[PDB]
Design a binder for this molecule. Structure first.
Ligand code: 3ID
Ligand code: 3ID
Ligand code: FE
Ligand code: FE
Length: 689
């Protein structure tokens, strides 16, 4: 029945004492118990935590990063919330603070004395350094980064630095004998405030700190006017201009925990009670976000408003974002490794069969294109958000998820439409495809209004033609979220493997990976969902009109297809009727947006460039198409892009998922969400909040 205490790791005596005050006040309020373990630096608590010696520790974005690394695999449980000078936020601006009348600019630090929060921290190291990489005249990784800084700065206090090999990096540190350059509050120059005192006490000329630091230490506006900030556009602006004069915007510190059996609910229950009982002016007996004047930021970040629970999918990589990761990862990569990655385009292939095609597209492009892969479409968007992939072609349904995660549509799939197939394609207003309900002519008893308890074949959950358009329509007539109960049994890859929704699925050839939302499931996609119907595993397949058309009348020679005839098939019209597959225009459930390519708004223009080339070489009219590679072809398996794709067209203005998908469909997708929501969609609500 009972549940124990959260073991909090501490890094310095002053920190232990505060913890003790926290353990004392937790039990006196009869709330969750804590315990205090004692290590000497945050990296050690990372170690101490992964080794099940400790359970929690607040880390700076930069250490979150290090802690998420392999051997440790820790994850951010809760994010501290801060000032903002406005609305509270879980982010903050890194600044470089200097005294007025020092004359230099951001591009002149060569030979200046500098004070840092600590080795490896967002604002005190990772961020300033990566900004000065160009002036470091640094070989790259083989040569220790600390050697570059130790030569560039005349003497600095970067705590945690190897002051025995790099004395110049610890020289300015004020500390007793072995306390000097200590990686805890032992060295007075440690942390936001220590780096500030190192400046104001005249040991250093530039302070790499947080936006609040100057305000936390100089409460009187007159004091602050003796100070300024160096802006990356090589000018100086008042300390109050951080929104304008900053090196970068990092994510807030956060409490980390183990990935497996980390006791997340325990920690969270602790901190929640702690904000409620000792948060901002809740108490006087003990204040969570307050410290002793000697050493600041003990345990948490002083004067933080509280914490926010970090959703479960989120790992450090997703926590930090593309931007922060690229830069940290960029201080561990070669100048040539960096510029290579910025020029190529990493595509996220969903599953085995797409990764191979991608591999062919990689080779044939002479590596202007490279690949990354995942088992599901959500995992790929995660890759795109982490910054490990640049794009992927998505269905109207997942444009929504991507779009909710801050991703933008670059170019849209334009099927071999009908007007005048000349250079119209890339400028042809995309026109969409009609999703339909398809059943065999035979079962003539079947009508739209008799689908209840019948078997169903679905392209997949989350997707338009299938899931969203029919489930959205039925949910309007039945008023229920029990989606797995309308159809007796179904195959809809991506569902719960144990539900009726996954019953008719089939998996790959040796029957493995049943219901997996990818090509490994033979019944996955428009192709598979139609097959599901042909091979008589289901009674109604929700697909677009064209799907029946491209797999009947010997067009597809894959065994199950071969003998199929478009006459054997009919569509289920919303008004009870049934028309031949040729009547979709007057008998469809809806008109959906074409799939479209998506990327960060960052790479969309580069992404667009490489794509026009790639598609002119291997597109619908690519010289080397039949020849060596056909981007828009895959033997009916619709890999990477649909097989009837003529080219990738312009968005005609529709630059946001909202404009592209259109109002209705977006509202239709939100209505369905009242029932089910998705882990990515949630994680993205936190991340983009
Ligand atoms: O979460 C905390 C953990 C440790 C690590 C030691 N001091 C700490 C700071 C914290 O607030
Ligand atoms: O129907 C499609 C076909 C393939 C196969 C796995 N990748 C794809 C996803 C879809 O959008
Ligand atoms: Fe920080
Ligand atoms: Fe579709």
């Amino acid at each position: 029945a009972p549940r124990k205490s959260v073991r909090w790791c501490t890094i310095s005596p002053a920190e232990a004492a505060k913890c003790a005050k926290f353990q004392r006040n937790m039990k006196k309020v009869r709330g969750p118990s804590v315990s205090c373990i004692r290590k000497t630096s945050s990296f050690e608590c990372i170690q101490a935590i992964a080794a099940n010696k400790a359970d929690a520790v607040t880390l700076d974005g930069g250490l979150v990063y290090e802690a998420g690394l392999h051997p440790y695999k820790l994850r951010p449980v809760a994010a501290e919330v801060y000032q903002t000078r406005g609305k509270p936020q879980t982010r903050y601006y890194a600044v470089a603070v200097v005294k007025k009348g020092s004359g230099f600019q951001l591009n002149q630090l060569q030979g200046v004395k500098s004070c840092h929060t600590g080795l490896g921290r967002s604002a005190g190291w990772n961020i300033p350094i990566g900004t000065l990489r160009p002036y470091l005249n640094w070989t790259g990784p083989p040569e220790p980064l600390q050697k570059a800084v130790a030569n560039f700065f005349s003497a600095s206090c970067v705590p945690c630095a190897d002051g025995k090999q790099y004395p110049n990096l610890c020289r300015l540190c004020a500390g007793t004998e072995a306390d000097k350059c200590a990686c805890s509050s032992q060295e007075p120059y440690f942390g936001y405030s220590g780096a500030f005192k190192c400046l104001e006490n005249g040991a250093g000329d530039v302070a790499f700190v947080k936006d609040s630091t100057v305000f936390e230490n100089l409460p009187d506006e007159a004091e602050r006017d003796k100070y300024e900030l160096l802006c990356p556009d090589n000018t100086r602006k008042p300390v109050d201009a951080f929104k304008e004069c900053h090196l970068a915007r990092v994510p807030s510190h956060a409490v980390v925990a183990r990935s497996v059996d980390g006791r997340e609910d325990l920690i969270w229950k602790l901190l929640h009670r702690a904000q409620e009982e000792f948060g901002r002016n809740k108490s006087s007996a003990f204040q969570l976000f307050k410290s002793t004047p000697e050493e600041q930021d003990l345990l948490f970040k002083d004067s933080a408003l509280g914490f926010v629970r970090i959703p479960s999918q989120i790992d450090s990589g997703l926590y930090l974002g593309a931007n922060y990761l690229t830069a940290t990862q960029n201080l561990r990569e070669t100048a040539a490794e960096v510029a290579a990655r910025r020029e190529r385009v990493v595509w996220c292939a969903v599953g085995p069969e797409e990764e191979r095609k991608c591999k062919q597209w990689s080779d044939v492009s002479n590596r202007k294109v490279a690949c990354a892969s995942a088992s599901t479409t959500e995992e790929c968007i995660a890759l795109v958000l982490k910054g490990e992939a640049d794009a992927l072609n998505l269905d109207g349904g997942f444009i929504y998820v991507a779009g909710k995660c801050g991703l933008v549509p670059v170019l849209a799939e334009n099927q071999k439409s009908q007007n005048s197939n000349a250079p119209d394609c890339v400028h042809r207003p995309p026109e969409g495809y009609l999703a339909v309900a398809v059943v065999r002519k035979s079962d003539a008893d079947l009508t739209w209004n008799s689908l209840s308890g019948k078997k169903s074949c679905h392209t997949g959950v989350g997707r338009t033609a299938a899931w969203n358009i029919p489930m959205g329509l039925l949910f309007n007539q039945t008023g229920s979220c029990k989606f797995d109960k309308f159809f007796s049994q179904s195959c809809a890859p991506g569902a719960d493997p144990q539900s009726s929704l996954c019953a008719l699925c089939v998996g790959n050839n040796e029957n493995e990976n049943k219901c997996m939302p990818n090509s490994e499931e033979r019944y996955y996609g428009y192709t598979g969902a139609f097959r599901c119907l042909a091979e008589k595993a289901g009674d109604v397949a929700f697909v677009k009109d064209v799907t029946v058309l491209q797999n009947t009348d010997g067009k597809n020679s894959e065994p199950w297809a071969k003998d199929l005839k478009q006459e054997d098939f009919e569509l289920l019209c919303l008004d009870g009727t049934r028309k031949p597959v040729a009547e979709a225009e007057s008998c469809h459930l809806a008109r959906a947006p074409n799939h479209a390519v998506v990327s960060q708004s960052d790479r969309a223009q580069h992404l667009k460039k490489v794509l026009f080339l790639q598609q002119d070489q291997f597109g619908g009219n690519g010289p080397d198409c039949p020849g060596k590679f056909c981007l828009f072809k895959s033997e009916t398996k619709n890999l990477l892009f649909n097989d009837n794709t003529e080219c990738l067209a312009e968005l005609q203005g529709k630059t946001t998922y909202e404009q592209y998908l259109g109002s209705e469909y977006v509202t239709s997708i939100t209505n369905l969400r009242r029932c089910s929501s998705s882990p990515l969609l949630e994680a993205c609500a936190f991340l983009r909040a």
